[PDB]
Amino acid sequence: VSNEEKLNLCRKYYLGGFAFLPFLWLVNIFWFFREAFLVPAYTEQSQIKGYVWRSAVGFLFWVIVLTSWITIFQIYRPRWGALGDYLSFTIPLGTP
Amino acid sequence: NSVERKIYIPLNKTAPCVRLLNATHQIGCQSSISGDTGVIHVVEKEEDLQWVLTDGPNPPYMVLLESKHFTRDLMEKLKGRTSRIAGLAVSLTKPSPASGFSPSVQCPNDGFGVYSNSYGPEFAHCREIQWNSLGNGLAYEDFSFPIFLLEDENETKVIKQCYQDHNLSQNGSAPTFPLCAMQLFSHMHAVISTATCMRRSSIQSTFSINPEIVCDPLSDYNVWSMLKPINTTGTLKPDDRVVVAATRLDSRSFFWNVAPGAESAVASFVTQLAAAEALQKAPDVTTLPRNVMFVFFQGETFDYIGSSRMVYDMEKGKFPVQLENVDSFVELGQVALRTSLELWMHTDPVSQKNESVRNQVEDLLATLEKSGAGVPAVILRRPNQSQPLPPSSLQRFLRARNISGVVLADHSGAFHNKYYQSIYDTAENINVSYPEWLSPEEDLNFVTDTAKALADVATVLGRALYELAGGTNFSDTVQADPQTVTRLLYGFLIKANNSWFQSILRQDLRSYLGDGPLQHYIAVSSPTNTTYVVQYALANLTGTVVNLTREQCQDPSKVPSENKDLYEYSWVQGPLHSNETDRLPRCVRSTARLARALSPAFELSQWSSTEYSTWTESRWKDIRARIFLIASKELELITLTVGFGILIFSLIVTYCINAKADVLFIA
Amino acid sequence: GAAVFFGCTFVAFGPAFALFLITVAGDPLRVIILVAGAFFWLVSLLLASVVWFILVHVTDRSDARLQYGLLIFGAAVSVLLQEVFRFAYYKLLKKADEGLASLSEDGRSPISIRQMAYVSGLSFGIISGVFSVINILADALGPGVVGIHGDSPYYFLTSAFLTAAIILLHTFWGVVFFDACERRRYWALGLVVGSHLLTSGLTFLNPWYEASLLPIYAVTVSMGLWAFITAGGSLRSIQRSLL
Amino acid sequence: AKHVIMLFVPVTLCMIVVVATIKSVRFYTHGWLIMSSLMLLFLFTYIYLGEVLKTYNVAMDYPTLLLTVWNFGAVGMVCIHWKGPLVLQQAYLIMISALMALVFIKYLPEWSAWVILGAISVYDGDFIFYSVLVGKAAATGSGDWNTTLACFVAILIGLCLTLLLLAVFKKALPALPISITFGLIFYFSTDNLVRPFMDTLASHQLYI
Ligand SMILES: *[C@@H]1O[C@H](CO)[C@@H](O[C@@H]2O[C@H](CO)[C@@H](O[C@@H]3O[C@H](CO[C@@H]4O[C@H](CO)[C@@H](O)[C@H](O)[C@@H]4O)[C@@H](O)[C@H](O[C@@H]4O[C@H](CO)[C@@H](O)[C@H](O)[C@@H]4O)[C@@H]3O)[C@H](O)[C@H]2NC(C)=O)[C@H](O)[C@H]1NC(C)=O
Ligand SMILES: *[C@@H]1O[C@H](CO)[C@@H](O[C@@H]2O[C@H](CO)[C@@H](O)[C@H](O)[C@H]2NC(C)=O)[C@H](O)[C@H]1NC(C)=O
Ligand SMILES: *[C@@H]1O[C@H](CO)[C@@H](O[C@@H]2O[C@H](CO)[C@@H](O)[C@H](O)[C@H]2NC(C)=O)[C@H](O)[C@H]1NC(C)=O
Ligand SMILES: *[C@@H]1O[C@H](CO)[C@@H](O[C@@H]2O[C@H](CO)[C@@H](O)[C@H](O)[C@H]2NC(C)=O)[C@H](O)[C@H]1NC(C)=O
Ligand SMILES: *[C@@H]1O[C@H](CO)[C@@H](O[C@@H]2O[C@H](CO)[C@@H](O)[C@H](O)[C@H]2NC(C)=O)[C@H](O)[C@H]1NC(C)=O
Ligand SMILES: *[C@@H]1O[C@H](CO)[C@@H](O[C@@H]2O[C@H](CO)[C@@H](O)[C@H](O)[C@H]2NC(C)=O)[C@H](O)[C@H]1NC(C)=O
Ligand SMILES: CC(C)CCC[C@@H](C)[C@H]1CC[C@H]2[C@@H]3CC=C4C[C@@H](O)CC[C@]4(C)[C@H]3CC[C@]12C
Ligand SMILES: CC(C)CCC[C@@H](C)[C@H]1CC[C@H]2[C@@H]3CC=C4C[C@@H](O)CC[C@]4(C)[C@H]3CC[C@]12C
Ligand SMILES: CC(C)CCC[C@@H](C)[C@H]1CC[C@H]2[C@@H]3CC=C4C[C@@H](O)CC[C@]4(C)[C@H]3CC[C@]12C
Ligand SMILES: *[C@@H]1O[C@H](CO)[C@@H](O)[C@H](O)[C@H]1NC(C)=O
Ligand SMILES: *[C@@H]1O[C@H](CO)[C@@H](O)[C@H](O)[C@H]1NC(C)=O
Ligand SMILES: *[C@@H]1O[C@H](CO)[C@@H](O)[C@H](O)[C@H]1NC(C)=O
Ligand SMILES: *[C@@H]1O[C@H](CO)[C@@H](O)[C@H](O)[C@H]1NC(C)=O
Ligand SMILES: *[C@@H]1O[C@H](CO)[C@@H](O)[C@H](O)[C@H]1NC(C)=O
Ligand SMILES: *[C@@H]1O[C@H](CO)[C@@H](O)[C@H](O)[C@H]1NC(C)=O
């Protein structure tokens, strides 16, 4: 697969992650690594070298936000009232 | 599988400690998910709790108590130390505790009567008389560990024998680490209160598929009838007068479905059913100037479920007998013991500050004593000290109307019942015991002294109701018989699968009559055993039989007589025609209707309410218990070390052999 | 607990997972040999269980001693059927040797007969160990151990070691069986099936864990040494292989 | 050779996801291709992730499981119907077959499933069938892993004999019924016939 189709891949493929899709960015930074940071055999690598730099800080941005919501919910679940219960998808049975 | 037969032993006759919930609190017991495992340690003296509380090598124990040690102070010492106790099993005692045992509170149904700081302030939290004087409050404490009851003695012998085989400590040393243990499963799906639980079960029932309901309203039906039939599709006229006779129908205990309720429940509605069939046999009963309604409220322990419901439907115009129509109210409390043939007449003192109501109550007590003077075995007394009213169903009607009412009971001060709302409140409490050389068919028809006492109580009550309806000519004809009383006592208290309870029910309902006695707990299963048995027993004792085919009995609309509005019909089984299986079924033209008993806090859906008995029950799944052996942590660490050692050794030897597969193998 | 479960699983499926992971999983041809061997073992077990079903429903279940003798005879005929279908799978590997290799192949050997013997024995071992230990491993997840009715507490660990011994014995039996079948030394053909009879007959002494598990590993060490010398190695082959 | 192993690792990892669901959850006791997959990637994920959390009794909220289904179904939609890696293309066909397998084991009645499969094979994508067939052996009866793993091996021999038949009969093969004929028999050949002969050996602690 040529560099033109790879550039047409990894710009729309990055552009999809702005619709709340961090797993797209995860398989992005997991997939173009040994083909963008191992072999220096491309003049058309500088877009692909930059996009995974633009995608690495984008994904781990969500890893802060998601676990900082998960912990702040699981700790402050019973201390909140029914507000901590209307937005609960599953509810554990015996524990409050 | 055949290996878990070598590991576990089930326990088959158990009764758990089930969590219930209030608006502001919860009561009961709960395990974790997947049980609580602990080493068995029996307790046969109060010195043995050194081994559990302080001197235990194997900390999360599981104590086994005789039920005569199941005290309040012992429960305080166990609830104050819960990191070392996960479980409890309680074995029943046949020489019942002569100190008495009542797990209910010191003053039942306190915040739901009439007496408040606005109405009856000197009588309010029963400051004058503590009614349940022995009550230690133990059945209203929350607990963090399972408490099961061992109904059998042989299971107790099995568990104690395994304790003697394994868990002993010799010569002041450690127990040998293959030890016996026991596991108790009761994971209640509910939490802090009924507001939380009802909301949390309302969201799961609405906003999602697979409704995960966790709580359940305690609900049942109020069985009620009339002496003379009424329309049931409208109401009565504003000048009609009925005389309500009333009696609770249920009980409970500390444990889940063991609700024997002999002195507190069974004797009272047995003598009222006898009063009903005595009054029905009057020769002038069609032309009475008033009417008589019998009612058997259910839910009365849990803060007057059926009584408050009957009042609320009676004032919201949804009941054919309105609250204008109630002339007099004769409640029937506990009447089984009667320590010196005395029968006390409890009235309300606060509503007698109105003068005309006071004169009506004085006329009521004069009527009671006039109708009771004809019986030489009942001595009617009234309390000298002007003291309040016992916890009964008149304390819901008096929240609305100030009807002229009286509560008959056998106690002036505290309860004579040593086992109020207890497991011990069985047939042996009221001296109901049959001789041992008789067939269990003649045990149905054998007459006890308790039956002959309750027959005299029912004779007094029936003649009282006959005079209250203005009967005034045939008073000696009204008399109950000990035969129906002893058949009802044997039916409820000893064996429910009678030859007489079978011949009064429909064909569909014979699954309700089990082997033992009926337990009297208001369950969520909305008609109960006891509700049907009382309904069809009242339907026999008041109704008559008619010639109708069964298809006519399903719908009597085609018959010019036999109205559908006034009466109600049932195709019941017959008696057994001998030498074959030939029931001879027939219709009954009775009036034993049912009414809904579910508190108006669950109809107005205001689940944090302070006057309508917000009691619910947790839902669960697979209450079970089992015993087994446990192994040391030394053996678990050794078996995991041997697993890792064999795995690492096999990988190293295979990787060494495969890498030298050239040299080691030649052709 | 889970500690006993993962301990006893690694005792049973320690060597078998080692051989399957290192040896067979790299070579994509051998997995078909593995599944075919396990298939013929299943057909063997079915054919024996038919006979035992026949005898248990003909003799009408009354006397328990005669049912025990029928259980012994059913285990014996199951052993005989395993050692018949091992010969059957040998003949199928010989038929699929020529019909695929050297007639549809240029090079005459993508796999020799020795590696086919090895993988066939490992296949019998894996499927027999799976049917022997997995139902016992499902009970190791419990909180309680064997011994309430006067049994031994060491039931799980001893069954794990028995399963591992049966796996290694089937692996060595397949190799020595096929090398006996080639050279037509029919006496060794009888010694493999006789040792199979002895290793499945000493499990009748089985609650006597002292001298009913040590002789099984004695037969396993003997069978491992004779399968090693039979495969081609020797003491001189070991003492000159440490370069 | 290599290609039969390319037909094992799909149909094996499909079964390990099904069997570990049956033995743990205990609840199952641009035209048409877009619409039938949106209600399969977003609705069956919302059920399967919803039910697997009810087992372990943890509390996940709507700001996460709505995000997690959106990060699974939409990436699964853009992987198949657009360009993605082959590994992630392969890993998604395993998951959608198991989700379509688990809806059949709950909804279909007692032993009608032994009729549907048979009729289909007689009258004759392939993953769903195998998955459903097993999971029926992974729940029925007592807890016995002998029937589940006998029907595991009995499918792969029907799979291998298909490609042995395809290497001589080149044109076309139904592939299903050889795995089904050995699969339908070897359920009813060990559930009631070998399960007695094992449990008596397991009683006296015997070995063969
Ligand atoms: C739902 O169901 C639960 C279960 O019963 C109900 O909970 C009960 O509510 C009662 C409300 O009156 C509680 O009674 C009060 O408890 C206070 C706490 O006392 C503590 O308890 C120990 C026990 O020995 C005492 O030694 C200590 O003093 C503790 O403080 C009592 O103080 C209180 O007694 C009062 O005394 C004053 C003195 O001036 C009087 O003026 C006053 O009238 C009152 O007698 C009273 O006993 C009860 O404890 C509580 N049960 C439990 C187990 O906690 C809920 O009320 C129900 N929800 C409803 C009805 O909405
Ligand atoms: C509770 O009932 C179970 C049956 O459901 C009893 O278990 C049986 O016990 C007998 C005698 O010990 C054995 O022969 C059976 O094999 C058992 N059946 C099983 C385990 O399924 C059990 O003994 C009873 N509990 C007690 C304490 O006796
Ligand atoms: C029932 O009778 C009592 C006793 O008279 C009534 O209580 C009195 O009510 C009046 C007016 O409501 C007030 O003076 C006091 O609340 C009471 N008087 C006293 C204590 O002297 C009560 O209102 C009657 N009705 C009901 C529905 O309870
Ligand atoms: C109350 O009625 C229920 C239902 O009719 C009885 O429950 C049955 O009990 C028998 C005896 O164990 C069982 O064989 C049935 O399966 C039970 N049926 C149901 C639907 O639970 C119950 O026994 C009755 N209570 C009493 C005290 O007799
Ligand atoms: C209530 O008692 C009756 C009479 O003993 C039981 O009816 C008999 O039950 C036995 C065994 O279940 C049957 O073989 C008979 O055919 C029954 N009918 C007769 C003798 O007329 C009935 O099963 C009992 N009910 C319960 C719930 O135990
Ligand atoms: C209530 O049940 C009793 C059961 O004894 C019925 O009494 C029997 O009735 C038949 C005919 O109705 C008589 O032949 C028997 O002699 C009666 N037995 C007695 C009195 O012990 C009674 O009929 C039933 N009542 C209704 C209204 O159904
Ligand atoms: C079930 C177990 C205990 C059976 C043991 C049988 C023993 C004693 C027999 C079986 C077959 C025998 C081997 C057969 C062939 C050879 C090759 C020969 O060049 C040296 C001896 C040697 C290596 C024999 C040694 C002894 C031997 C291993
Ligand atoms: C359970 C009670 C009632 C009966 C016990 C019977 C015992 C003593 C009998 C029955 C089965 C027998 C075994 C059957 C077969 C073999 C294989 C043979 O190569 C050596 C003897 C050996 C190992 C026998 C030893 C004795 C044995 C274990
Ligand atoms: C209670 C005492 C006095 C008598 C009984 C002791 C028994 C239970 C002990 C003593 C010797 C032990 C064995 C010693 C060695 C082995 C070999 C090992 O690979 C598996 C366990 C096994 C087989 C042990 C099992 C348990 C065992 C049989
Ligand atoms: C308890 O055991 C004794 C002794 O065998 C037996 O006679 C009795 O019937 C048993 N009772 C119960 C309720 O199991
Ligand atoms: C009351 O009884 C009469 C019969 O006299 C009947 O016609 C009517 O339907 C009944 N019900 C009412 C008025 O609700
Ligand atoms: C007393 O009760 C009667 C009837 O309920 C009522 O008419 C009268 O007004 C009451 N009197 C007082 C002072 O409450
Ligand atoms: C009646 O009751 C008394 C005490 O309640 C008791 O002693 C007596 O045994 C009972 N039975 C008879 C027949 O008197
Ligand atoms: C009995 O008294 C009532 C009271 O009114 C009366 O109506 C009736 O006629 C009397 N009985 C006879 C037989 O006269
Ligand atoms: C009783 O009913 C039957 C059937 O309905 C009828 O044939 C018979 O005449 C009736 N007898 C009387 C006395 O009413």
Q: In three state form, how does the secondary structure of chain C look? A: CHHHHHHHHHHHCCHHHHHHHHCHHHCCCHHHHHHHHHHHHHHHHHHHHHHHHHHHHHCCCCCHHHHHHHHHHHHHHHHHHHHHHHHHHHHHHHHHHHCCCCCCCCCCCCCCHHHHHHHHHHHHHHHHHHHHHHHHHCCCCCCCECCCCCCCCCHHHHHHHHHHHHHHHHHHHHHHHHHHHHHCCHHHHHHHHHHHHHHHHHHHCCCCCCCCCHHHHHHHHHHHHHHHHHHCCCHHHHHCCCC
| Residue (of B566, D24, D152, B36) closest to C39 by Cα position | D152
Q: Which two tokens stand for residue D57?
A: 């009794």
Nearest CA-CA distance, residue D79 and chain C, Å: 28
Neighbour-count burial of B558, counting CB atoms closer than 10 A to its CB (0-12 exposed, 13-18 middle, 19+ buried):
exposed
For CA atoms C167, C168, C171, C172, give the dihedral sign.
negative
Q: Which two tokens stand for residue C10?
A: 């690694």
| Residue (of B290, B160, B302) closest to B217 by Cα position | B302
CA distance C131 to D150: 9
Residues B508 and B561 reside in one and the same domain: no
CA distance B103 to B67: 12
- Bridge partners for C13 per DSSP: none
| Terminal C-alpha separation, chain A | 56
Q: Which helix (H) or strand (E) element contains residue B328?
A: strand B326-332
- Bridge partners for B26 per DSSP: B21
Question: CA-CA-CA-CA torsion for C190, C192, C194, C196, nearest 10 degrees?
Answer: -150
**Would you say C178 and C120 are in contact if contact means Cβ atoms under 8 Å apart?**
yes
CA distance D156 to D14: 13
Task: Enumerate residues 6+ apart whose C-beta is below 8 A from B171.
Answer: none
Residues B177 and B313 reside in one and the same domain: no
The structural domain count of chain C equals: 1
**CB count, 10 Å around CB of B128?**
13
Q: Which two tokens stand for residue C43?
A: 């057909």
CA distance C111 to C29: 8
Q: Which two tokens stand for residue B6?
A: 């070598």
Method of determination is cryo-EM
Burial B423-440 (b: 16+ CB within 10 A, else e): bbbbbebbebebeeeeee
- Measured CA distances, B501 to B56, B448, B569, C185 (Å): 53, 19, 18, 84
Contacts of range B412-415, beta carbons closer than 8 Å, 24 or more positions apart: B412/B344, B412/B381, B412/B383, B413/B129, B414/B129, B414/B130, B414/B131, B414/B132, B414/B133, B415/B131, B415/B132, B415/B133, B415/B334
Nearest CA-CA distance, residue C184 and chain B, Å: 18
Binding site membership of B356 for ligand 12 (Cβ less than 6 Å):
yes
- Measured CA distances, D158 to B147, C77, D113, D114, D195 (Å): 55, 28, 20, 18, 23
Q: Describe the strand order of the beta sheet including B404-409 as a list of residue ranges.
A: B379-381, B342-346, B404-409, B326-332, B242-248, B291-297, B220-226, B593-597
Pairing verdict, β B624-630 and B9-10: antiparallel
| Ligand 8 atom, smallest distance to D204 CA | 1
| Terminal C-alpha separation, chain C | 46
**Would you say D92 and D76 are in contact if contact means Cβ atoms under 8 Å apart?**
yes
Q: In three state form, how does the secondary structure of C9-52 look? A: HHHHCCHHHHHHHHCHHHCCCHHHHHHHHHHHHHHHHHHHHHHH
Q: Which helix (H) or strand (E) element contains residue B89?
A: strand B85-91
CA distance B647 to C37: 24
CA distance C42 to C85: 10
Q: In three state form, how does the secondary structure of B256-272 look? A: CCCCCCHHHHHHHHHHH
DSSP-derived secondary structure letter, B473: S
Q: At B458, phi and psi to the nearest 5? A: -70, -30
Task: Enumerate residues 6+ apart whose C-beta is below 8 A from B538.
Answer: B223, B225, B273, B276, B294, B296, B590, B592
Is the residue at B124 inside a domain?
Answer: no
CA distance D113 to D105: 8
Furthest C-alpha separation in chain D: 62
Helical pair C155-183 and C113-137, crossing angle rounded to 10 deg: 160
**CB count, 10 Å around CB of B461?**
30
| Ligand 13 atom, smallest distance to B433 CA | 11
- 3-class DSSP assignment, residue D74: helix
In a mutational test of the A interface, the residue from B30, B185, B186, B200 whose CB has the highest number of chain A CBs within 10 Å is B200
CA distance B388 to B404: 15
- Bridge partners for B624 per DSSP: B185
Q: Using a CB–CB cutoff of 8 Å, tell me whether A96 touches chain B.
A: yes
CA-closest residue to ligand 12 atom 7: B356
CA-closest residue to ligand 4 atom 17: B511
Task: List chain B residues with CB under 8 Å of D54.
Answer: 212
**CB count, 10 Å around CB of B3?**
22
Q: Do C203 and D207 touch (CB under 8 A)?
A: yes
CA distance D93 to D125: 10
The structural domain count of chain B equals: 4
Q: Which two tokens stand for residue B661?
A: 């597969």
Q: Do D4 and C28 touch (CB under 8 A)?
A: yes
| Residue (of B175, B145, B114) closest to B28 by Cα position | B145
**Would you say D130 and D15 are in contact if contact means Cβ atoms under 8 Å apart?**
yes
The stretches of chain D forming alpha helices (DSSP H) are 2-5, 8-25, 32-41, 43-56, 62-80, 86-107, 113-123, 126-137, 145-166, 176-188, 195-203
* Residue labelled with tokens 């298809």: B551
* Residue labelled with tokens 């003909």: C58
- Measured CA distances, C242 to B323, B652, B657, B662, C239 (Å): 106, 16, 12, 12, 7
Task: Enumerate residues 6+ apart whose C-beta is below 8 A from B169.
Answer: B175
**Would you say B619 and B216 are in contact if contact means Cβ atoms under 8 Å apart?**
yes
Furthest C-alpha separation in chain A: 62
| Ligand found nearest the CA of B523 | 4
CA distance B387 to B349: 7
CA distance B337 to B454: 10
- Bridge partners for B512 per DSSP: none
How many whole angstroms from C204 Cα to the centroid of ligand 8?
A: 6
Listing DSSP states for B488-557 in one string gives HHHHHHT-SS-SSSTTSS-GGGGGG--SSPPP----SSSS-HHHHHHHHHHHHHH-EEE---HHHHH-GG
Question: CA-CA-CA-CA torsion for B48, B52, B58, B63, nearest 10 degrees?
Answer: 90
Q: Do A88 and D71 touch (CB under 8 A)?
A: no
**Would you say C16 and C167 are in contact if contact means Cβ atoms under 8 Å apart?**
yes
**Would you say B93 and B66 are in contact if contact means Cβ atoms under 8 Å apart?**
yes
| Residue (of A67, A49, A63, A68) closest to A7 by Cα position | A49
Binding site membership of B507 for ligand 14 (Cβ less than 6 Å):
no
| Terminal C-alpha separation, chain D | 33
Helical pair D62-80 and D43-56, crossing angle rounded to 10 deg: 140
CA distance B564 to B102: 46
Residues B194 and B342 reside in one and the same domain: no
Cα R_g (chain B), whole angstroms: 30
CA distance B266 to B430: 10
Pairing verdict, β B404-409 and B576-577: unpaired
CA distance B74 to B63: 11
CA distance B359 to B353: 10
What single letter denotes the amino acid at residue B401?
R
Chain B residue closest to A95 (CA)?
B191
Q: Do A82 and B32 touch (CB under 8 A)?
A: no
For CA atoms B510, B512, B514, B520, give the dihedral sign.
negative
Binding site membership of B169 for ligand 14 (Cβ less than 6 Å):
no
Q: Do C28 and D5 touch (CB under 8 A)?
A: yes
Q: Do A82 and B187 touch (CB under 8 A)?
A: no
What single letter denotes the amino acid at residue B68?
K
For CA atoms D60, D63, D65, D67, give the dihedral sign.
negative
For CA atoms B626, B631, B632, B636, give the dihedral sign.
negative
**Would you say C24 and C122 are in contact if contact means Cβ atoms under 8 Å apart?**
yes
CA distance D151 to D181: 11
Burial D17-26 (b: 16+ CB within 10 A, else e): bbbebbeebe
- 3-class DSSP assignment, residue B169: coil
Is the residue at B117 inside a domain?
Answer: no
Domain boundaries, chain A: 1-96
The stretches of B170-301 forming alpha helices (DSSP H) are 194-206, 267-280
CA distance C135 to D145: 7
Task: List chain D residues with CB under 8 Å of A75.
Answer: none
- Bridge partners for B295 per DSSP: B224, B246
- 3-class DSSP assignment, residue D118: helix
**Would you say B149 and B255 are in contact if contact means Cβ atoms under 8 Å apart?**
yes
Last residue of a domain, one of B523, B543, B563: B543
- 3-class DSSP assignment, residue B576: strand
Neighbour-count burial of D153, counting CB atoms closer than 10 A to its CB (0-12 exposed, 13-18 middle, 19+ buried):
buried
Q: Using a CB–CB cutoff of 8 Å, tell me whether D132 touches chain C.
A: no
Task: List chain D residues with CB under 8 Å of B203.
Answer: none
Q: Is residue D205 left, alpha or beta, with left meaning phi > 0 and alpha meaning psi from -120 to 50?
A: left
CA distance B64 to B40: 7
Residues B436 and B558 reside in one and the same domain: no
Q: Which two tokens stand for residue B344?
A: 């006390």
**Would you say B276 and B537 are in contact if contact means Cβ atoms under 8 Å apart?**
no
CA-closest residue to ligand 3 atom 21: B353
Nearest CA-CA distance, residue D85 and chain B, Å: 33
Q: At B103, phi and psi to the nearest 5? A: -80, -5
Residues B529 and B655 reside in one and the same domain: no
Active site residues of D: 124, 126
Pairing verdict, β B179-185 and B624-630: antiparallel
Is the residue at C243 inside a domain?
Answer: no
Task: Enumerate residues 6+ apart whose C-beta is below 8 A from B208.
Answer: none
Residues B230 and B305 reside in one and the same domain: yes
| Residue (of B413, B409, B357) closest to B385 by Cα position | B413
CA distance C122 to C34: 7
Neighbour-count burial of B157, counting CB atoms closer than 10 A to its CB (0-12 exposed, 13-18 middle, 19+ buried):
exposed
Assign 3-state DSSP to chain B and report helix, strand, coil percentages, each to 5. 30, 20, 55
DSSP-derived secondary structure letter, B142: B
CA neighbours closer than 13 Å in the CB half-sphere of residue B539: 29
Q: Using a CB–CB cutoff of 8 Å, tell me whether A93 touches chain B.
A: yes
Q: Which two tokens stand for residue B513?
A: 């009559």
DSSP-derived secondary structure letter, B45: S
Pairing verdict, β B36-43 and B220-226: unpaired
CA distance B148 to B258: 11
Helical pair B449-468 and B267-280, crossing angle rounded to 10 deg: 50
Pairing verdict, β B582-583 and B624-630: unpaired
Task: List chain B residues with CB under 8 Å of D202.
Answer: 2-3
CA distance A36 to A31: 9
Helical pair D195-203 and C30-58, crossing angle rounded to 10 deg: 80
CA-closest residue to ligand 8 atom 24: C201
| Residue (of A7, A15, A64) closest to A32 by Cα position | A7
- Of the partner residues D71, D83, D85, the one whose CB lies closest to the CB of residue A23: D71
Task: Enumerate residues 6+ apart whose C-beta is below 8 A from D113.
Answer: D104, D105, D132, D136
CA distance C142 to C133: 15
Quote the Cα angle for B498-B503-B504, to 5°. Answer: 105
Tell me which residue range forms the domain holding B462. 220-543
| Residue (of D206, D153, D150) closest to C166 by Cα position | D206
CA distance C9 to C133: 9
- Bridge partners for B513 per DSSP: none
| Residue (of D88, D76, D104, D89) closest to D18 by Cα position | D104
CA distance B28 to B21: 8
CA-closest residue to ligand 13 atom 13: B449
**Would you say B31 and B17 are in contact if contact means Cβ atoms under 8 Å apart?**
no
Residues B326 and B422 reside in one and the same domain: yes
Q: Using a CB–CB cutoff of 8 Å, tell me whether C51 touches chain D.
A: no
Tell me which residue range forms the domain holding C103. 1-232
Output the domain CATH number for residue B481: 3.40.630.10
Q: Do A87 and D62 touch (CB under 8 A)?
A: yes
CA distance B516 to B173: 47
